[model samples]
Target chain A: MNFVLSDVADAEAEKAIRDPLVAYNLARFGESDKRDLNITIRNDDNSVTGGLVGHTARGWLYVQLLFVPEAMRGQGIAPKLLAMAEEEARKRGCMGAYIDTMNPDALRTYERYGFTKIGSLGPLSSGQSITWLEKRF
Target chain B: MNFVLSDVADAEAEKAIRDPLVAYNLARFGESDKRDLNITIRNDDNSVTGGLVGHTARGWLYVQLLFVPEAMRGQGIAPKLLAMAEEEARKRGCMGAYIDTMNPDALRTYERYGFTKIGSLGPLSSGQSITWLEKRF
Candidate 1:
């Protein structure tokens, strides 16, 4: 009946929240067996430049984040990364892929890749808006 | 440049990362003027049982999280909170509202409120899937 704001170590917090949630979700939804399908673009020296982080779950692919360096823009890297993600999703038997973006350029890029806008939200406190997009296989 | 994985205070980290991003997004997107619209349910003793956190941006409302305690289940608090959010969005000149959830019960709750499923992703490692929903004002 008492609550307080405090910080805990990563492992401790994960166990307190994620562990229980995962257990309950597994029992209720029969387990998705999710797998990360992240792709990274590294420099020649193995330094990271940009990448996309996503996962496949429940017959779908979710793109969590997509980033490209300013210097790397206009090099067709973004589409290639997206295409690779889609290919991996297909390999994993995903039915569709979804992503959300607040950047206008990213939205245009997704649209050109055949991802349609499904939902949107914003002018948030930061004056940014997000558009959710999906591409069905 | 150099790369490091050092940890810092939460406020310090927020300032270093969020401040810059906000400036960049504003300059690039021409000011969305977004704002937060969170709603909370509190017990008589001032303990929080459930709540929703979202933001208004670009004529849309994005619901980030909606949580209800197990002890408060079946009381229809979720829907009421959602309705209040929607009303607030409309008052702010929002064209629609959207939310994403991985819980079956939440998905059903949102659907009953006329929110349509626009995208889905799952069986994640947690054995659950996510559904993105939207409701136009």
Candidate 2:
């Protein structure tokens, strides 16, 4: 057989590749049964300030992103939001949670909220480091 | 409030955290969903020689790890395995795929397979760089 390479963006091509992969995963692992656990903090005006975006899968809550405005720091908003997410996760039957960060302050914050470092990677081109942390309910 | 840090591994604590988190994800994502897509190449005696571990989510495939034993290298196994994965993904309805690596050779290999460099990070503590790449179907 032969293959050709193209530097074009093709939405149809993407869909053509994804469908079968999804079916294979479902058949092999019996479905992720994943769900979004994203939480956003809004002001009275309904504007988003800061929050977390993540998902629960295979008995674990994976936090993909978490952000809080600088002005909102030290006001206990981060921890409070985290608690809310954990509570909601518990209600949904999640047993553990995990997240990763490249920011030192964020790492410290997660630690304060009972998350522990499980893995780390890099010093990278800019001396950046990524840390993975987890918390068990 | 107060915080206490522990450096112990507790299975019970892990279970407590995971149970509800998993439940929440299941409730939100649904049953018969999400699966681990790990493919391994084994010898006649069932000894693993190479493999790829990844997952499909939200129309995207995330490649967590890919390795081909040194003895099995130079035979185009890597690209072949990748093509197979893409084919499977297409069947599953995935639209794109992503992977990260620190190895220069692997990076070159991925580029040859149609993945484009999207991001990079670190020199880490060991002065290693991590590159993230992606492909659309």
Candidate 3:
């Protein structure tokens, strides 16, 4: 698996991740770049393989966005990308990392990475309950 | 001078409301769906003019989506639609209302309705700041 980290600005990345479900939620409460943390993964051909985005507050990294191309999933690529983020968090002295997944597949990915289930947000934009998990860095 | 309220399901309404900027924001943190307050407005020809969608939380209305058709704007239809929402909020015993707006036009409209500025969030998907506001009912 080839993964690299770089600063690509949120605006540039958003153009590629315009899923309708995600948009409804953000339109309601909104978002702030000043509070964001993110990383992206790309293939040798320059197609985006996956990415991770989060927000930091009080020394904790809130892992918000983690998308792996559908066909590329189940290849254990997610854990590897997450590990890269964890390493970066450790360098920044983060206390812990948190992420949420609404689907069973995503939940399994988080569990595989040792993320423990902590909470659930209901009526998510996907009209499903989202499982929230946290990992101590 | 002509505004009416028609109900739509939360899931379906989301389809009409979701956009790129909205999606990225929800990918992080979480979203709210209080009591599923949903409504839309149309012209005499049965064409949409503007709409309001939101949920009620703890006796407060959270206006999640509001859209006015481009050509139909500046005819002062939005305020009428908002007034209909306020009436609904009062019927539901809401104490206040909250909404998130990024467009200056929409923000100004809310300001005219006595919505007080709360804070700002962004870089979300668009790398732009979204202003948050609240109004006492």
Candidate 4:
């Protein structure tokens, strides 16, 4: 009737998290098929600023994080970044794409790339609003 | 004026995602402070059914996933699941927790734990609605 909660990052606790979920998900869904999608912007000095950090799985693509360099902002970098990612997502048979962001500017940029708002978590006592958005492929 | 997107996952491309973000976040906020949380339900046979898969970072605890076995449901296991996670969350100085689910049942369960709707991405042509919820600590 009672289960224990432990904060320690011990071996037992570490495997406790992975073993159960892996076996359970594999039993029902077969196996993990997550594919990473990283399209980054590299500078002349050979540095990546940001593009998209995400994965595609279960027939959908997820954008966990994304950003573009300051020098490339107004030159159509963001949209192209999304376009390449979305194109690859569809190629992988993904039916939808979802992204969440705290930056309103990024939200509008996503809207420009055909993504619409899903929901906002809001003006936390910290005065920040987190919004989730999606695009149907 | 142009950049190419490649599908190959090379060593350079692999670090391209992490190197930039890590430095960026570090330069702006210092070091990584993510903490893992794992709570599992064990039966007499010594197997974990489900619990919570989440973490606390940047003043927020995120519930990436949560579940409880059917036999233990009406016994009030789910609420305790949240109670323990939330209690531990507060200890880590996290002032908020966020979660998303496609099941109305889970949404209701989260509501009982004081998590209200942040937003819902609906009835996708697949007829499933995904709701994001949050609880302020």
Query: Evaluated with TM-score, which candidate comes out highest?
Result: 4
TM-scores of all candidate predictions against the true structure: 0.63, 0.51, 0.41, 0.75
Per-residue lDDT tens digits of candidate 3, residues A8-93? 22332222222332354356545422244555454565433345555564445667666665566677766876787777666656
DockQ of model 3, rounded to 2 decimals: 0.04
Return the TM-score for candidate 2, rounded to 2 decimals: 0.51
Candidate 1 regions exceeding 4 Å error are: A1-24, A44-47, A90-93, A102-105, A114-131, B1-24, B32-50, B87-95, B101-105, B111-131
For each candidate, report its DockQ versus the true two-chain complex: 0.11, 0.04, 0.04, 0.33
- Which candidate number has the best lDDT? 4
Q: What are the per-residue Cα lDDT tens digits for candidate 4 across A1-137?
A: 44767555555644665675566555654544678877867766756656776787666787876666656678777788788889999998778888887666777888988998877764543455778888997
Q: Could you tell which candidate, 1 or 3, scores higher by lDDT?
A: 1
Worst-scoring 10-residue span by lDDT in model 3 chain A: A1-10
Tens digit of per-residue lDDT, candidate 3, span B4-117: 112222332222223322463356434432455555454565433346566665556667667555465787666766776777777767677767666777889989978877
Runs of candidate 3 with Cα error greater than 4 angstroms are A1-137, B1-34, B45-49, B122-127
**Model 1 quality (TM-score):** 0.63
Clashes of each: 20, 53, 10, 0
Across A54-137, the per-residue lDDT of candidate 2 in tens digits comes to 676656676765655556678886787688778767776777777776567778999999998765544422344557777887
User: What is the DockQ score of candidate 4, to 2 decimals?
Assistant: 0.33
State each model's CA lDDT, in order: 0.69, 0.62, 0.57, 0.72
Q: Under the 3 Å rule for N, CA and C atoms, how many clashes does model 3 have? A: 10
The digit string of per-residue lDDT tens for model 1 on A33-132 reads 5777766565667555556667777788878766666676798777988898998888877788888888888899999999998766555445566778
Off by over 4 Å in 2: A1-12, B1-137
